[PDB]
């Protein structure tokens, strides 16, 4: 059960507390796409993981237009 959850996550390495206090394997399924977390995978076993369903690259040239000026009537 617990290792099935973890099959959705990439173990990156040692705990990195930049990413908060260790989580439970059950709390792991509350992450956002691509989100890194520290998780407790056994007694005295805390590692950094990344979610395998991932985030997208930042768009730039692809359609944005947040603000638009009106140059003329038509």
């Amino acid at each position: 059960v617990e290792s099935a959850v973890l099959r959705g996550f990439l173990i990156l390495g040692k705990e990195d507390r930049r990413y908060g206090p260790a989580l439970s394997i059950n709390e792991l399924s509350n992450l956002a796409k691509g989100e890194k977390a520290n998780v407790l995978i056994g007694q005295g076993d805390v590692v950094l993981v990344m979610k395998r369903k991932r985030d997208s690259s930042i768009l730039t040239d692809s359609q944005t237009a947040t603000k638009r000026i009106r140059m003329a009537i038509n």
Partner: protein, 417 residues
């Protein structure tokens, strides 16, 4: 005819003179791509322009003033903020109930710039109740140019995921999207789909809203739209969905999503390549039925090809796809991967500078080896022959101790006599 003169005549109690002056201020604000906005803001014209919105007796003046304000708000955050700090926003909302289309439309436009400035501005314009008046304009009798502006503001309303748009907004906007996704106009279609992007980007709860609306069977087919701008956005939208749960992912696959991917994996544009394998990487992170579906759709060799000959971006996405399959899949599913010659193009990525990719490849190799049991040596031999072992061997350096440790254990468990 100076700026200081313009602000003076704009104060006149006469309306002809005033309108003329406000028209002049608008003209200074639409003469190029870098208008004298800061100067206009400093002239004291802002409160005057704002008060003109009150003038129901003069739609020309309301429209001209709104136009000048719109252009000031099209600028930087500080310049947009100057407009909202003049208390313009509630008057724009008022003008959305104007019986005159010109005034309505310029109010919509100006509000779009203000909404687009950020989530706080978005939330404020929303809380005053912009969405329902906005979406009411959507009718078949509305002029396309008007409708394009509405749909653009609709996007801005959906943008920013921390904090994401409120429940009420999303529930209002989704059924309007169901309508607009059927439009033939390309600009509108693009916006409708980008609004769905952002909606699906706020996470799994919002994705369920998009799914529950019934819009996805109409969205997946836009992966093959003749218009690349539509495809790019539909790829992002549907792609966001399949970062959701397995059940959510399945909703998309059941709309025959994977049939659309040969033409994206071989697309001329590398950006489309990259986003296509990104998408597919999120599928190989699914269950076994979903890994099987990628295989059955004959997509793996195009993945391994892009993994081999693609630009770095697409290769990065390709390695994840492979690695994700390597832990999602059955034994035979991985066997297929190997007999499709994944081992050499996968190993060649161990040289790249992006450390994450390298751990992702190393993680892949490790799963492959721990999974193929009698074939550990057999696959060990594949890794070695393409020069992978050589690449793994010298990843045993300390510049990345996570990479190091993983390189060591593979070599200790699988390549030590």
């Amino acid at each position: 005819t100076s700026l200081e003169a313009i602000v003076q005549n704009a104060s006149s109690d006469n309306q002809g003179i005033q309108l003329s002056a406000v028209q002049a201020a608008r003209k200074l604000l639409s003469s190029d791509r870098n208008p004298p906005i800061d100067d206009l803001i400093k002239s004291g014209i802002l409160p005057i322009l704002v008060h003109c919105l009150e003038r129901d007796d003069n739609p020309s003046l309301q429209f001209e003033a709104a136009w000048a304000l719109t252009n000031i708000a099209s600028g930087t955050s500080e310049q947009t903020q100057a407009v909202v700090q003049s208390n313009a926003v509630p008057l724009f909302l008022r003008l959305l109930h104007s019986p005159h289309q010109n005034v309505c439309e310029q109010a919509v436009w100006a509000l779009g710039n203000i909404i687009g400035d950020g989530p706080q501005c978005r939330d404020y314009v929303i809380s005053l109740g912009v969405v329902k008046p906005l979406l009411s304009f959507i009718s078949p009798s509305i002029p396309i140019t008007f409708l394009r502006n509405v749909t653009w503001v609709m996007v801005n309303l959906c943008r920013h995921k921390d904090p994401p748009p409120p429940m009420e907004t999303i529930q209002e906007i989704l059924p309007a999207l169901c309508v607009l996704i059927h439009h033939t106009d390309v600009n509108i279609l693009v916006d409708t789909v980008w609004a769905l992007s952002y909606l699906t980007d706020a996470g799994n709860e919002q994705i369920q809203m998009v799914i529950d609306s019934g819009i996805v069977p109409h969205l997946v087919p836009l992966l093959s739209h003749q218009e690349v701008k539509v495809q790019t956005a539909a790829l992002r939208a549907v792609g966001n969905i399949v970062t959701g749960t397995d059940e959510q992912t399945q909703v998309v696959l059941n709309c025959d999503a994977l049939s659309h991917f040969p033409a994206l994996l071989t697309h001329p544009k590398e950006k489309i390549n990259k986003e296509a394998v990104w998408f597919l990487s999120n599928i190989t992170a699914g269950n076994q039925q979903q890994v099987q579906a990628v295989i059955d759709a004959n997509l793996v060799p195009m993945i391994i090809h892009l993994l081999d000959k693609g630009d770095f971006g697409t290769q990065k996405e390709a390695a994840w796809a492979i690695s994700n399959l390597t832990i999602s899949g059955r034994k035979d599913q991985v066997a297929y991967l190997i007999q499709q010659n994944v081992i050499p193009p996968f190993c060649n990525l161990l040289t790249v500078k992006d450390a994450q990719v390298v751990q992702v490849v190393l993680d892949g190799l490790s799963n492959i080896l721990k999974m193929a049991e009698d074939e550990a040596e057999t696959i060990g031999n594949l890794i070695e022959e393409c020069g992978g072992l050589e690449k793994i061997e010298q990843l045993q350096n300390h510049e990345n101790e996570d990479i190091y440790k993983l390189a060591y254990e593979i070599i200790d468990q699988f390549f030590s006599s």
